[PDB]
């Protein structure tokens, strides 16, 4: 079939621009908290089956099947509580969606936390949000108070015997704290330093208890998925890329924006049918960073004749990531752009892993030199080998995300680097 052109009735995230209200009354008028009591009373297994049949995949980092991920914690009680944790930490460049969600549709997030907690047999839902999002978190807590007061949260959740506690928690300005385990440690009060897996949070997570991690988007879409059957969500993407999606389009575009479209939507249609279109025209474009800065880049020759989904982006070697398109054009220095982007990772590394720690700075220096051209081509393959050394010999995926961009750049823009080097050689 074909894809794109999603309708405002099949859209999930209304109030996306705050043109309606974001309070309990507006959420009621939009559909939130409808039948949630029966969604609960159906039981967890029902909800997990809906997740599975929905073909839903994680909307944070690497899309992983939410059904299996959440059923990992469908288990008995070893004598400890069991928690849910929503990583509202949204620090990956080009991403501005969770902010809008948390400040416009917080009641959806509350309902999704409740539903996931029931699905897992949990007790409390911590929401770890960036410490820079102060007003957004304040609105979120206002909504949580509205719920606690109404009676949709707490002891008798919505008319059942389920008790649930929703807590908000703030960070202090760290990008690594988006990681499953770094977030957990930061909540526990330690530094934002990840853990080695195993063990997996499903067994030993927050405070040592079974904690399931999730994302704002995923948990907030869960309820609509449940009350719409899964076969609706499922029928908008390819066999495995099913679902709507939030795309943050920025860069050298006329009208940068944040949109919700059908998955498998051509990037070109996403830039034209929305976003106001690239600046200078379709031919001024140079390349794209589709799925966030961590992901590598693809040039125009592929940006055209390409879809937008985990598969058919893996083929182009740039995973979908967070769906944060960063467009560029012929009036740029891709080397300087990606060098600043690697400096980002150099600053945001936590420190412990040898490869990451001692190699992201090496790479930042090498790229700062490559910009001017104070090198010789023999260093490009060395950069490649170093990136490959960092890729899989780390703890978390920050090293992988810092390596992939260099691979993409060296693979699709090598002649520019060689020319810069030759020009430096000429003008010693």
């Amino acid at each position: 079939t074909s894809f794109g052109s999603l309708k405002d009735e099949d859209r999930i995230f209304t109030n996306l621009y705050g043109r309606h209200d974001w309070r309990l009354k507006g959420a009621l008028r939009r559909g939130d908290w409808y039948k949630t009591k029966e969604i609960l009373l159906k039981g967890p297994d029902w909800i997990l089956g809906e997740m599975k049949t929905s073909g839903l995949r994680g909307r944070g980092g690497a899309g992983f099947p939410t059904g299996l991920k959440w059923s990992f914690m469908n288990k008995p009680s070893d004598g400890r509580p069991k928690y849910l944790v929503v990583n509202a930490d949204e620090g990956e460049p080009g991403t501005c969606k969770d902010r809008e969600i948390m400040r416009h549709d917080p009641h959806k997030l509350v309902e999704g936390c409740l539903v996931g907690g029931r699905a897992m047999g949990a007790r409390a839902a911590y929401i770890y949000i960036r410490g820079e999002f102060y007003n957004e978190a304040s609105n979120l807590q206002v909504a949580i108070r509205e719920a606690y007061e109404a009676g949709l949260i707490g002891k008798n959740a919505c008319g059942s015997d389920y008790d649930f506690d929703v807590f908000v928690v703030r960070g202090a300005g760290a990008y690594i704290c988006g990681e499953e385990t770094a977030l957990i440690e930061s909540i526990e009060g330690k530094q934002g330093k990840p853990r080695l897996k195993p063990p997996f949070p499903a067994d030993v997570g927050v405070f040592g208890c079974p904690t399931t991690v999730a994302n704002v988007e995923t948990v907030a879409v869960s309820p609509t998925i449940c009350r719409r059957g899964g076969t609706w969500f499922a029928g908008f993407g390819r066999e495995r890329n099913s679902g709507t999606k939030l795309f943050n389009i920025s860069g050298h575009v006329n009208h940068p924006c944040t949109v919700e479209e059908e998955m498998s939507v051509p990037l070109k249609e996403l830039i034209e049918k929305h976003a106001g279109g690239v600046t200078g025209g379709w031919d001024n474009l140079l390349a794209v960073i589709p799925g966030g800065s961590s992901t590598p880049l693809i040039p125009k020759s592929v940006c055209e004749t390409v879809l937008m989904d985990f598969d058919a982006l893996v083929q182009a070697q740039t995973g979908l990531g967070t769906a944060a398109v960063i467009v560029m054009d012929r009036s740029t220095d891709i080397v300087k752009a990606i060098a600043r982007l690697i400096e980002f990772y150099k600053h945001e590394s936590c420190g412990q892993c040898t490869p990451c720690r001692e190699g992201v700075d090496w790479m930042n220096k090498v790229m700062a030199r490559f910009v001017k051209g104070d090198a010789r081509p023999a260093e490009i393959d060395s950069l490649w080998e170093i990136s490959k050394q960092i890729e899989g010999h780390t703890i978390c995926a920050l090293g992988d995300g810092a390596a992939w961009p260099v691979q993409g750049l060296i693979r699709h823009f090598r002649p520019e680097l060689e020319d810069r080097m030759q020009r430096f050689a000429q003008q010693h």
Partner: protein
């Protein structure tokens, strides 16, 4: 129709913790580990 999210133009530093305090009364008894701390 026009913009609505204009409540945050007047928030203040201690807002979030004031509300966390207001809700501490609605919270439920947390569990226990049988220990004051890991010592």
């Amino acid at each position: 129709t026009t913009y609505k999210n204009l409540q945050h133009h007047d928030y203040n530093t201690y807002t979030f913790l004031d509300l966390n305090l207001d809700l501490s009364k609605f919270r439920l008894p947390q569990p226990s580990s049988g220990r004051e701390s890991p010592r």
